[PDB]
Amino acid sequence: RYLDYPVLWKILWGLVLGAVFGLIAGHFGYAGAVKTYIKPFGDLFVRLLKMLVMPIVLASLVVGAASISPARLGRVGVKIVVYYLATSAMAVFFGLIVGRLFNVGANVNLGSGTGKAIEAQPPSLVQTLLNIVPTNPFASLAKGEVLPVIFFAIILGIAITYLMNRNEERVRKSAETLLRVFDGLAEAMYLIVGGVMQYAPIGVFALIAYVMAEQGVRVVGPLAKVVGAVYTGLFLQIVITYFILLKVFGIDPIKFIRKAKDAMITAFVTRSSSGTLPVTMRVAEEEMGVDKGIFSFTLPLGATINMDGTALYQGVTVLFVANAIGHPLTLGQQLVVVLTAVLASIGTAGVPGAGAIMLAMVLQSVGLDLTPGSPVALAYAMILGIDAILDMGRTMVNVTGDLAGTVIVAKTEKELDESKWIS
Amino acid sequence: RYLDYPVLWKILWGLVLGAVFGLIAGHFGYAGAVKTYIKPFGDLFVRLLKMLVMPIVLASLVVGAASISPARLGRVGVKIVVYYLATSAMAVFFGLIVGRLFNVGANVNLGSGTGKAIEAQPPSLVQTLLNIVPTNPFASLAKGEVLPVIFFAIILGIAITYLMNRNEERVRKSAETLLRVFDGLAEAMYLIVGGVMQYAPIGVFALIAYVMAEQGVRVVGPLAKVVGAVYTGLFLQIVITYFILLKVFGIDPIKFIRKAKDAMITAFVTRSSSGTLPVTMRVAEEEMGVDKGIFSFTLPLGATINMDGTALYQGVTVLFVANAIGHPLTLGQQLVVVLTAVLASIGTAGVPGAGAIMLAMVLQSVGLDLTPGSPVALAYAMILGIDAILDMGRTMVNVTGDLAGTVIVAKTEKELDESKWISH
Amino acid sequence: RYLDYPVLWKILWGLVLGAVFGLIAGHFGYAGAVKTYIKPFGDLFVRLLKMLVMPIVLASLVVGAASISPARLGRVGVKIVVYYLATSAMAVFFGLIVGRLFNVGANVNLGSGTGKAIEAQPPSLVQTLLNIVPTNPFASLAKGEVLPVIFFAIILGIAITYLMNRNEERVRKSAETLLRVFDGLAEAMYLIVGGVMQYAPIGVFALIAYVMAEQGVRVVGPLAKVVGAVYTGLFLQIVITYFILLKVFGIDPIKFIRKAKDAMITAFVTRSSSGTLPVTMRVAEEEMGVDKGIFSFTLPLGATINMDGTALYQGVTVLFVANAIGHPLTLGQQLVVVLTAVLASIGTAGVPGAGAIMLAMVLQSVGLDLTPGSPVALAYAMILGIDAILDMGRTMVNVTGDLAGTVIVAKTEKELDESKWIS
Numbered sequence A, C: 001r002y003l004d005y006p007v008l009w010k011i012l013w014g015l016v017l018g019a020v021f022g023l024i025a026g027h028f029g030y031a032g033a034v035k036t037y038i039k040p041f042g043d044l045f046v047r048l049l050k051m052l053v054m055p056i057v058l059a060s061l062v063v064g065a066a067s068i069s070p071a072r073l074g075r076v077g078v079k080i081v082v083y084y085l086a087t088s089a090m091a092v093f094f095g096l097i098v099g100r101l102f103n104v105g106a107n108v109n110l111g112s113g114t115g116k117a118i119e120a121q122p123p124s125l126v127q128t129l130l131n132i133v134p135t136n137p138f139a140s141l142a143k144g145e146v147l148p149v150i151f152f153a154i155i156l157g158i159a160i161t162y163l164m165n166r167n168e169e170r171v172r173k174s175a176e177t178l179l180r181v182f183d184g185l186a187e188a189m190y191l192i193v194g195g196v197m198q199y200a201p202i203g204v205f206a207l208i209a210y211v212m213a214e215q216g217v218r219v220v221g222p223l224a225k226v227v228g229a230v231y232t233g234l235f236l237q238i239v240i241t242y243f244i245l246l247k248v249f250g251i252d253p254i255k256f257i258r259k260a261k262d263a264m265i266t267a268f269v270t271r272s273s274s275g276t277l278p279v280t281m282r283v284a285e286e287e288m289g290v291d292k293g294i295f296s297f298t299l300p301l302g303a304t305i306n307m308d309g310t311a312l313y314q315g316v317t318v319l320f321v322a323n324a325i326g327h328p329l330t331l332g333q334q335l336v337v338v339l340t341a342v343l344a345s346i347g348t349a350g351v352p353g354a355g356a357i358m359l360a361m362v363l364q365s366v367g368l369d370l371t372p373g374s375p376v377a378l379a380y381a382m383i384l385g386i387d388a389i390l391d392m393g394r395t396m397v398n399v400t401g402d403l404a405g406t407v408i409v410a411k412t413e414k415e416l417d418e419s420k421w422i423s
Numbered sequence B: 001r002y003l004d005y006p007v008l009w010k011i012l013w014g015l016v017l018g019a020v021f022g023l024i025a026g027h028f029g030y031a032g033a034v035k036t037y038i039k040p041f042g043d044l045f046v047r048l049l050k051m052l053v054m055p056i057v058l059a060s061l062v063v064g065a066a067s068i069s070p071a072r073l074g075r076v077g078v079k080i081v082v083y084y085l086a087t088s089a090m091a092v093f094f095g096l097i098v099g100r101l102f103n104v105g106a107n108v109n110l111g112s113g114t115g116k117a118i119e120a121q122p123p124s125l126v127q128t129l130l131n132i133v134p135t136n137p138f139a140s141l142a143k144g145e146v147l148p149v150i151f152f153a154i155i156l157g158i159a160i161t162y163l164m165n166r167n168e169e170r171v172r173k174s175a176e177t178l179l180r181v182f183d184g185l186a187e188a189m190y191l192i193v194g195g196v197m198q199y200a201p202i203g204v205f206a207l208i209a210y211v212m213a214e215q216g217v218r219v220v221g222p223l224a225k226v227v228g229a230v231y232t233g234l235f236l237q238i239v240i241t242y243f244i245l246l247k248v249f250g251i252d253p254i255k256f257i258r259k260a261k262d263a264m265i266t267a268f269v270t271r272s273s274s275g276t277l278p279v280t281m282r283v284a285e286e287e288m289g290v291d292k293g294i295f296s297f298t299l300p301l302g303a304t305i306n307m308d309g310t311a312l313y314q315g316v317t318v319l320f321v322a323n324a325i326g327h328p329l330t331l332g333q334q335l336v337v338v339l340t341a342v343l344a345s346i347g348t349a350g351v352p353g354a355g356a357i358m359l360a361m362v363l364q365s366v367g368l369d370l371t372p373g374s375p376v377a378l379a380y381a382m383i384l385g386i387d388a389i390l391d392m393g394r395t396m397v398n399v400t401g402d403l404a405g406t407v408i409v410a411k412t413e414k415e416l417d418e419s420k421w422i423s424h
């Protein structure tokens, strides 16, 4: 009887009520009760979306790569990769600026020497690039590996179209049947995404409630200042980077935000961009009128290697650690931070646990090593205390950047349905 | 020269001859030879049947969920879950009764104090229920996890039907092509099931022979009384619970048993219900006239969370252990046993080794802890010595209960083909 | 920009140039540079080929087993298995002959006792044969298990054909749709194989260069004789065994080598028969005109259980070790070597790491045990020092034998397209 209420209002109600409920439950210490009785519903929501992530990616990208020329696909790839790199660098820049504004970690007052102990190397860029090419596509499917599925789906769709243009009719009909199987699978997946969005408000409520209950009490003092800095920086990344980039390429930013709100809230509460990918793709298709041959390629790739929010978070935490141990970063050191954050977002393409590897890389780049028992590790552990509070906002901005780049590239390729943007 | 012989006679001959052969070979101690030369054929049979389980489940259920309304699907689910819980409770009750009748373990005479230190714990019910929803369906397919595949296949079939009732023709044609792929796969699977049933007598013979050769000598003394008890209870669970439930809803029980015979014997010799699933569904379709939209959903669900024979076995062994260590169970304790056995069938939905987790849970419910070196662990090992002899019958009764509940629900939903139930 | 150059000549140029480049770089000690900068390209080639192996096998075999009668399928299986066993025995015989000819290991002069302790075990024939039948075909697909996928695809194709000959129309149309899906998948796979053969020269160059640079310096002294022996034997296995078997059944051997050159060079540089399988199947179809219902079954089966080159290598290395420790093999011992080499080719059907298992098995068959610190283990390590130089030729001859047997069985079943064999 509740399905009749509109979904977007229900999701916003769940968000607001879960935030307030979690704060109130953590203020009275019932956070364990929230983890035991309320959290499983949000976990169910996240499982329902993660269920859809792999089939929708495989099928939608086979279809899209079929419904597009290889030259256009490569041009779109170059465009979207340039967008991703530029926006990530801008996110690190905004993170450093907002950190210097908030003066994060200035009152932690830890003593640190000039000692330096050599650590291990980051995972090889070459091996990750080779790992883009799978050695068993069924295996990469079972393992949830996005980038190799992207590669295989693109190759499969291109082969299918080249087969549909043959003289023999049996070959054409076989390729047509195969493409129909993928299209029916994709349609079913998007249908199910729409179905799951009906339960989405409950999961939104439960997830925001659990996070607020477990980490609301920790947002005081310097960690509170960190939270304020990170969220301000994210806000700027949307309102300056994304809005100016959308106006430069002629897209109404407010309509963009209104359409993306669903993927935004899903990413904010699930804190997993790849797990928001189904809602993100459904917003790209059935809200913004982006063609499948664009978003079916850019959105998984973007969920994997485009995290503006993570880059801004890294800029803030590196300023925090440097100011907390008492060695503020020189200008050239912050330039190294930006360069290393972008190159490390690239180099960490699809590995698990990439957040901490990237953060360790950025810290090591300026000579802040995570030796155990050292003040640097201490400040890093301080930051990790509010990691979920930060993860919400950073994942939201990651998905929002994915969508903005998708829309910009689609507008530049005239693959954007303008009829969705006129009132 | 082989295929021309009738199949039912061949499987029955293989069962009986393998039982006698295994008994005779194990009584004279050549059981190792049976393990080396005879068992691999039964192993081949089990592998051939296990091979089909995942494709046939996925395809049959996508097809069935497509060819049915979501409201009817929900009604069937509620019906079959009520049937399953009621029959499991009835099985624990029958196990307790037959155990009290045979006075199992009364002459083991072990000394036991009243000390108990907690060892096991239940796997969280919430996490088990959440694990039903997969997070990667390709992975769940690869790992053989039935319940998440069931969930994904139902969601996919419903989406396919909702797409076929759309206005655009391209969407209809894509959804129909997909449903045809799944239907062709399922048809191929059932074809292969029929083909493998030709080799079934050899594997049946080998399996019953190996089990009889390895565990025939052990059916003496108190364990003998256990076997005689357990099988009796299993028999009663078939003859009273199933037959009365079938006559209540207007199903001739003898026709039901005659049709289920193939799945019954397969479950009895392979001792894995999910591994019997292909024969069970092929019997449900091509023998009992159950609609795919019913059995394609109930039979795997029943193989996973409906084990009447295992519940009756638990009822028997709890009385056995309590009588062996010298502490017979109170009436209220037996009621708690029934309640916890039913709740534990749910709580172990799809976990590996669920038999022992459920048994440990039921024992702990009445305060019998399996600390090593204690007399309770000793009696439990006594019981585990004949686990295969018991596993045959209990798995058979698990599969038979699945089939009976499926036919009952199909009769109540007018989804049952009456033309298959008329004799000439 | 170089794509316009013909492909086969480019593959030959890459082979020769990589051999020379690797030799030159390894003699001057720059092998690390080759491993760091050159090898990743050959690795990319090998991963690209490995990607296709599972889909092409599954789909091509479903199609072929569908498009053939079960009686003919069984006849073809018997024929190709007899061919495989005969050629493996012949290869062991040639290996023993060329080893005794080159007097391999005669000048190592190691002292050896008479101790014999068993190392690894053979997997029980019963358990391996049972393992041929999968218990989850999705699992075998994900794990790359070739033999169970072969079994499942054959059973599925036979079921599909039996369904297409039914009276109900829904059954016919469903099975027909499924077979269309598998046919489209296989067609797409062969298309992509052809596409990857465009990058094949780069990978050929890189692989041969890396191998020659890392193990070129080691081909001196007694090991040099081993190389001289092994390749000689390999050469003989091609020019006597295969040529006589092709001439007996009326196939011009030179045309066969000309058509097979692609799979030959791919096997030689990638050293993986299953990884050459796509090129091998494409050569069987679009060069030799072998029907899918033949090669789609014999070629994966041959890559798995037909290794003439490996058998010849075993024949050479057992004589090498026996002469190195000072106990040359009696006539009955060499007969035991041949028998056990064939029986071990059968018994290790599909196990991982079978290369070392088979060699340890044959050595144990003649009483040469790999106890650590023993001289037998020492000679085995000597051979493993040049195992890669040997592996190139070994895989090449394994794949060539696969193709030769496929063409012979196809000629005997009148499933061979003669129009490709006219000058």
Ligand SMILES: CCCCCCCCCCO[C@@H]1O[C@H](CO)[C@@H](O[C@H]2O[C@H](CO)[C@@H](O)[C@H](O)[C@H]2O)[C@H](O)[C@H]1O
Pocket (backbone or CB within 6 Å): A003, A191, A192, A194, A195, A196, A198, A199
């Ligand atoms: C584990 C148990 C979880 C319980 C969750 C309950 C599932 C929700 C019940 C179904 O609700 C409907 O599902 C449709 C699915 O199609 C949605 O249509 C959506 O999808 C279609 C897109 O083609 C369009 O009808 C609409 O744009 C779009 O609202 C529609 O909103 C919604 O009312």
Ligand SMILES: CCCCCCCCCCO[C@@H]1O[C@H](CO)[C@@H](O[C@H]2O[C@H](CO)[C@@H](O)[C@H](O)[C@H]2O)[C@H](O)[C@H]1O
Pocket (backbone or CB within 6 Å): B003, B187, B190, B191, B192, B194, B195, B196, B198, B199, C162
């Ligand atoms: C390790 C090697 C294993 C070899 C397995 C042995 C194969 C035996 C030869 C074929 O035997 C027939 O195979 C058919 C299927 O292939 C079956 O059709 C059956 O299956 C159909 C299912 O659609 C039914 O409709 C038919 O009525 C029914 O005859 C049939 O019963 C069976 O006699």
Ligand SMILES: CCCCCCCCCCO[C@@H]1O[C@H](CO)[C@@H](O[C@H]2O[C@H](CO)[C@@H](O)[C@H](O)[C@H]2O)[C@H](O)[C@H]1O
Pocket (backbone or CB within 6 Å): C187, C190, C191, C192, C194, C195, C196, C198, C199, C286
């Ligand atoms: C830095 C270098 C990187 C290079 C990567 C770029 C890949 C471009 C591939 C171009 O090569 C063509 O690919 C076609 C397949 O895509 C082949 O068609 C072939 O494939 C069909 C198979 O269906 C056959 O029937 C046809 O006869 C046959 O022309 C064709 O032979 C081949 O020339």
Ligand SMILES: COc1ccc(NNc2ccc(CO[C@H](C(=O)O)[C@H](N)C(=O)O)cc2)cc1
Pocket (backbone or CB within 6 Å): A271, A272, A273, A274, A307, A310, A351, A352, A353, A354, A355, A391, A394, A395, A398, A399
């Ligand atoms: C402890 O929680 C975990 C832990 C591990 C995983 N698996 N893989 C993975 C890999 C990388 C990330 C970084 O991405 C963003 C961020 O964290 O900065 C944010 N989450 C986003 O999705 O955009 C995130 C996850 C998932 C959740």
Ligand SMILES: COc1ccc(NNc2ccc(CO[C@H](C(=O)O)[C@H](N)C(=O)O)cc2)cc1
Pocket (backbone or CB within 6 Å): B271, B272, B273, B274, B307, B310, B351, B352, B353, B354, B355, B391, B394, B395, B398
């Ligand atoms: C000993 O071999 C095995 C093989 C697999 C496992 N893991 N999963 C599992 C889960 C539940 C059961 C209970 O089901 C019956 C029983 O045993 O009571 C009987 N098997 C049947 O299929 O109906 C049995 C197994 C454990 C042991």
Ligand SMILES: COc1ccc(NNc2ccc(CO[C@H](C(=O)O)[C@H](N)C(=O)O)cc2)cc1
Pocket (backbone or CB within 6 Å): C271, C272, C273, C274, C307, C309, C310, C313, C351, C352, C353, C354, C355, C391, C394, C395, C398
């Ligand atoms: C690097 O390549 C490989 C390839 C496969 C694996 N896995 N298991 C396996 C399987 C087979 C072999 C036989 O080996 C042949 C030889 O050497 O005579 C030659 N390599 C060949 O493929 O025909 C050896 C091993 C590991 C590495």
Ligand code: NA
Pocket (backbone or CB within 6 Å): A083, A084, A085, A086, A087, A088, A089, A306, A307, A308, A401
């Ligand atoms: Na970016």
Ligand code: NA
Pocket (backbone or CB within 6 Å): A271, A272, A273, A274, A275
């Ligand atoms: Na993620």
Ligand code: NA
Pocket (backbone or CB within 6 Å): A273, A302, A303, A304, A306, A307, A308, A398, A399, A402
């Ligand atoms: Na992202």
Ligand code: NA
Pocket (backbone or CB within 6 Å): B083, B084, B085, B086, B087, B088, B089, B306, B307, B308, B401
């Ligand atoms: Na029950």
Ligand code: NA
Pocket (backbone or CB within 6 Å): B272, B273, B274, B275, B303
């Ligand atoms: Na089971």
Ligand code: NA
Pocket (backbone or CB within 6 Å): B273, B302, B303, B304, B306, B307, B308, B398, B399, B402
């Ligand atoms: Na059952």
Ligand code: NA
Pocket (backbone or CB within 6 Å): C083, C084, C085, C086, C087, C088, C089, C306, C307, C308, C401
């Ligand atoms: Na051979």
Ligand code: NA
Pocket (backbone or CB within 6 Å): C272, C275
């Ligand atoms: Na390999």
Ligand code: NA
Pocket (backbone or CB within 6 Å): C273, C302, C303, C304, C306, C307, C308, C397, C398, C399, C401, C402
């Ligand atoms: Na081979």
